[PDB]
Design a binder for this molecule. Structure first.
Ligand SMILES: *[C@@H]1O[C@H](CO[C@@H]2O[C@@H](C)[C@@H](O)[C@@H](O)[C@@H]2O)[C@@H](O[C@@H]2O[C@H](CO)[C@@H](O[C@]3(O)O[C@H](CO[C@H]4O[C@H](CO)[C@@H](O)[C@H](O)[C@@H]4O)[C@@H](O)[C@H](O[C@H]4O[C@H](CO)[C@@H](O)[C@H](O)[C@@H]4O)[C@@H]3O)[C@H](O)[C@H]2NC(C)=O)[C@H](O)[C@H]1NC(C)=O
Ligand SMILES: *[C@@H]1O[C@H](CO)[C@@H](O[C@@H]2O[C@H](CO)[C@@H](O)[C@H](O)[C@H]2NC(C)=O)[C@H](O)[C@H]1NC(C)=O
Ligand SMILES: *[C@@H]1O[C@H](CO)[C@@H](O[C@@H]2O[C@H](CO)[C@@H](O)[C@H](O)[C@H]2NC(C)=O)[C@H](O)[C@H]1NC(C)=O
Ligand SMILES: *[C@@H]1O[C@H](CO)[C@@H](O)[C@H](O)[C@H]1NC(C)=O
Ligand SMILES: *[C@@H]1O[C@H](CO)[C@@H](O)[C@H](O)[C@H]1NC(C)=O
Length: 555
């Protein structure tokens, strides 16, 4: 029923809702993340990446609905959601709301008899291109054939039987587990990804829909299977990967957890060494191990301790092939849970030399066990916004002028980062391949991100209406329980001096967008308003007439 209009990528655009024959738009104060998540699910577009206010995909025409959608979040249709007519707002079409959903992938098969076979093409940065044969597996093929409604995947032939194509190769590495129902639901990396030999391109043959798509396997009674395909209730089924890493801050690090007898469980760190970790990292397509961690380094598990005294020599393609003590009944506690850090683990930081700054510094990436600088070549404002969103700031920032210093000191990891529309992390952005080399500050990137809190419409930047950035868009704070202790937190976070006032009742003017917080009840010693007790993320009965303000002293 709902439609997205005016987007550049699929599953994006301005939100439009029909009643009767009349389409209308929704004001950016009326449409929550929960309502956005119901729309993305209903439209088969995955999950919500961004809620965007301010007529980002252009202003609409005609009707604007006066209704708020009070979705719980798990409704199947937007029509099932409770609707509250709010008082008749000052919303024009310059505040029509918009949504980026997660299934923005543009992928197809070209030059076979049907769309059920051919060379894989991916559209990135307005341009169709191939994928590398070495970057594409059978798990990826099963997901794509289900997406194209073409049954199951038969083959991934390497010798280009449908033509190499007259075009570019994207170096993207999909890491589908095999149980996903759209390529947009799979984890994917493009950052630093290696080139492949010319014309070594990926191809898929699907079965067609004369076979139905396999369901995921649901059983953990037996020893886990090392094949993609298992047998369950007289039907073939895709093995859901019964190994995960948790609490590592990424796909290729964290505590090793294993699914058996209906429960996720941990591994004891006795005899847990690098060879064991290598097998884990191989099985997850995470490269090689750089660390086998013990001593509950990423935290302690909730569930049984299934495996102990695992002694892989490193041959094995799965941890289930390794010699252990078998399932359950071991003489150790969760203070010794095992984990890994693998060579494909990626992390991101800004480093200030003398500190004081929170959203500013030299951009650095962690890869293959090492930190290194990100080069500044080709780097657009939109790429800096993705960086700044990923580091926990607002989605905008500025690159400092290049240093005159042409003499090499630090290691660089990657350069030529060029983010497309849609990802909110740097890892799905194409670049040059990883190359550890020495580099001068001439080549390095210093970033000043916009903070996720600001004061608008006063005589300094330390005085005005409180606005907070969350989930895509700037929004406001309601003034119920908003006191001087809240203002002392806002002033401290901005790096202003003493709080003078906690203003109420839209004293510097009403804002736009959603109202992200109400019932903010700070102790008063917090370093950020995100540490404060509040009714978080858009559940409020307020309007923009009740917007909160802070006035602080400079310096
Ligand atoms: C297996 O795949 C094929 C191919 O499907 C298409 O390609 C894949 C890659 C996907 O993208 C998929 O979404 C595509 O559709 C499926 O064949 C298609 O099947 C659909 C559904 O049955 C057909 O639509 C119609 O059935 O067409 C009927 C009219 O058929 C005449 O006209 C067609 C051209 O328009 C001719 O191809 C056909 O030979 C006839 O001469 C029409 O009666 C149907 O409409 C009625 O029912 C719908 C609800 O389903 C209702 O909304 C309407 O009001 C109406 O009452 C319907 O339009 C496709 O024409 C057909 N495409 C091709 C290329 O053959 C196949 O269904 C699928 N099998 C399974 C098990 O899923
Ligand atoms: C993961 O492995 C690396 C490599 O051994 C560890 O880095 C070293 O840490 C020790 C002690 O902290 C230092 O003496 C070495 O100089 C470091 N070497 C290198 C090459 O970086 C790292 O500490 C390990 N991390 C975890 C969590 O186990
Ligand atoms: C602000 O003050 C509160 C006091 O209520 C500090 O809260 C403590 O948090 C830890 C969490 O590990 C508790 O174990 C302590 O018992 C709490 N109270 C005290 C008195 O320490 C809070 O950490 C303070 N924050 C800042 C940034 O100063
Ligand atoms: C496993 O469970 C899922 C979700 O309940 C279901 O859709 C699927 O058909 C099941 N598959 C098998 C082989 O039992
Ligand atoms: C406000 O403006 C001054 C002018 O240079 C700037 O230095 C300062 O960092 C700004 N403060 C905030 C909280 O934006």
């Amino acid at each position: 029923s709902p439609r997205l209009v005016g987007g550049d990528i699929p599953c994006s655009g301005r939100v439009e809702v029909q009643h009767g024959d009349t389409w209308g738009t929704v004001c950016d104060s009326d449409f929550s993340l929960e309502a956005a998540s119901v729309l993305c699910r209903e439209l088969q577009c995955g999950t919500v990446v961004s809620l965007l206010g301010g007529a980002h995909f252009g202003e609409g025409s005609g009707q604007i609905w006066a209704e708020e959608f009070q979705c719980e979040g798990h409704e199947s249709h937007l029509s099932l959601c409770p609707v509250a007519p709010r008082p008749d707002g000052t919303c024009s079409h310059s505040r029509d709301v918009g949504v980026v959903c997660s299934r923005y992938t543009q992928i197809r098969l070209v030059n076979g008899k049907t769309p059920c076979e051919g060379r894989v093409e991916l559209n990135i940065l307005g341009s169709w291109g191939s994928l590398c044969n070495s970057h594409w597996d059978m798990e990826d093929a099963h997901v794509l054939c289900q997406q194209l409604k073409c049954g199951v995947a038969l083959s991934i032939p390497g010798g280009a039987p449908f033509g190499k194509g007259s075009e570019q190769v994207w170096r993207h590495m999909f890491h589908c587990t095999g149980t996903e129902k759209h390529m947009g639901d799979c984890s994917v990396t493009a950052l630093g990804a290696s080139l492949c030999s010319s014309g070594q391109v990926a191809s898929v043959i699907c079965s067609g829909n004369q076979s139905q798509t396999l369901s995921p396997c649901n059983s953990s009674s037996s020893d886990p299977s090392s094949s993609i395909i298992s047998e369950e209730n007289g039907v073939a089924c895709i093995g859901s990967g019964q190994l995960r890493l948790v609490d590592g801050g990424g796909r290729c690090a964290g505590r090793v957890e294993v699914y058996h007898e209906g429960s996720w469980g941990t591994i004891c760190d006795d005899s847990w060494d690098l060879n064991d970790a290598h097998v884990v990292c191989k099985q997850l397509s995470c490269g090689w191990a750089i660390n086998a961690t013990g001593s509950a380094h990423f935290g302690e598990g909730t569930g049984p301790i299934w495996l102990d005294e695992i002694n892989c020599n490193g041959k094995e393609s799965h941890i289930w092939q390794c010699h252990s003590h078998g399932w359950g009944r071991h003489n150790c506690r969760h203070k010794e849970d095992a984990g890994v850090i693998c060579s494909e683990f990626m992390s991101l930081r800004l480093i200030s030399e003398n500190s004081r700054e929170t959203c500013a510094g030299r951009l650095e990436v962690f890869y293959n066990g090492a930190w290194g600088s990100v080069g500044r070549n080709s780097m657009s404002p939109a790429t800096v916004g993705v960086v700044c969103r990923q580091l926990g700031c607002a989605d905008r920032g500025d690159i400092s002028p290049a240093s005159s210093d042409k003499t090499v000191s630090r290691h660089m990891w990657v350069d030529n980062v060029q983010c497309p529309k849609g990802p909110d992390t740097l890892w799905q952005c194409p670049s040059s391949p990883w190359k550890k080399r020495l580099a001068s500050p001439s080549e390095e990137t210093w970033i000043t991100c916009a903070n996720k809190i600001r004061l608008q419409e006063g005589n300094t930047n330390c005085s005005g209406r409180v606005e907070i950035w969350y989930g895509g868009s700037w929004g406001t704070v309601c003034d119920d329980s908003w006191d001087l202790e809240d203002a002392q937190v806002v002033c401290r976070q901005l790096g202003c001096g003493s709080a003078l006032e906690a203003g109420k009742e839209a004293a510097f003017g009403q804002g736009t967008g959603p109202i992200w917080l109400n019932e903010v009840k700070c102790k008063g010693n917090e370093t950020s308003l995100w540490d404060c007790p509040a009714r978080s993320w858009g559940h409020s009965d307020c309007g923009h007439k009740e917007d909160a303000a802070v006035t602080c002293s400079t310096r």
